[PDB]
Amino acid sequence: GSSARQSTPTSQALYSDFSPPEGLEELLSAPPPDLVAQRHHGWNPKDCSENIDVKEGGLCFERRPVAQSTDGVRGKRGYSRGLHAWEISWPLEQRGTHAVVGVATALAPLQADHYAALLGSNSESWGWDIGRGKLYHQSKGLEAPQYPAGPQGEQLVVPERLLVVLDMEEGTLGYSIGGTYLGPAFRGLKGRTLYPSVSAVWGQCQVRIRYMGERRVEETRRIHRD
């Protein structure tokens, strides 16, 4: 507040730069027990929380320090071959959280954007963000004014379960629930395809993940005859 004299200057016009990591990896660099393997086996997309340990047996995210670097992270590229699909879910029963995922495209052009014609930068990222449910969109909502409900609310906020289909043999991937929204959008995705990325918040919202089709090369006899 401002009732006393001695105060604290809290003004930093810029992006973000609190306390970055610089010594923890040295703890992971060593033999990581059910933390480096159990995490990449739990819900690990790729550029996602690697410094923390997450294991199934009850979707449980585990980190040493704090979300500052261990929790609050998202996998991005993650390139794989063959047609496969995965599943993800965000349990909100806790109290307050936010599922964050989406696909990014580097080839994303910029001629007649769906809107009309604004411009272009270096790439394009489109996916499902819970920012469409924040407090920046409430008073003005055409949703059912009678009871709490909204079908179009899952267009970028599905607090329950979601099935993502990603195939490389074609290079087309999309995000749908149970395979609902991913039929007709397969004719434009062939060129709109982007890299699938997922963002997980603190371990309080621990999101669930079910993947089928991916493995882990090593030596097991796999298929050899394209």
Swiss-Prot record:
Location of the B30.2/SPRY domain: 21-216
Outcome following mutation: Y115F: Loss of interaction with NOS2
Segments for region (Disordered): 7-29
Annotated phenotype, changing V201A: Loss of interaction with PARW. No effect on interaction with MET. Loss of interaction with NOS2
GO molecular function: ubiquitin-like ligase-substrate adaptor activity
Location relative to the cell: Cytoplasm; Cytoplasm, Cytosol
Main location: cytoplasm
Cellular component, GO, one term: cytosol
Outcome when changing T193A: No loss of interaction with PAWR
Listed pathway(s): Protein modification; protein ubiquitination
Keyword Translocase: no
Keywords: Cytoplasm, Ubl conjugation pathway
GO biological process: intracellular signal transduction; protein ubiquitination; ubiquitin-dependent protein catabolic process
Family membership: Belongs to the SPSB family.
Domain notes: The SOCS box domain mediates the interaction with the Elongin BC complex, an adapter module in different E3 ubiquitin ligase complexes. Essential for its ability to link NOS2 and the ECS E3 ubiquitin ligase complex components ELOC and CUL5.
Function statement: Substrate recognition component of a SCF-like ECS (Elongin BC-CUL2/5-SOCS-box protein) E3 ubiquitin-protein ligase complex which mediates the ubiquitination and subsequent proteasomal degradation of target proteins. Negatively regulates nitric oxide (NO) production and limits cellular toxicity in activated macrophages by mediating the ubiquitination and proteasomal degradation of NOS2. Acts as a bridge which links NOS2 with the ECS E3 ubiquitin ligase complex components ELOC and CUL5.
Subunit structure: Component of the probable ECS(SPSB2) E3 ubiquitin-protein ligase complex which contains CUL5, RNF7/RBX2, Elongin BC complex and SPSB2. Interacts with CUL5, RNF7, ELOB and ELOC. Interacts with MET. Interacts (via B30.2/SPRY domain) with PAWR; this interaction occurs in association with the Elongin BC complex. Interacts with NOS2.
Protein name: SPRY domain-containing SOCS box protein 2
Source organism (scientific name): Mus musculus
Gene that this polypeptide is encoded by: Spsb2
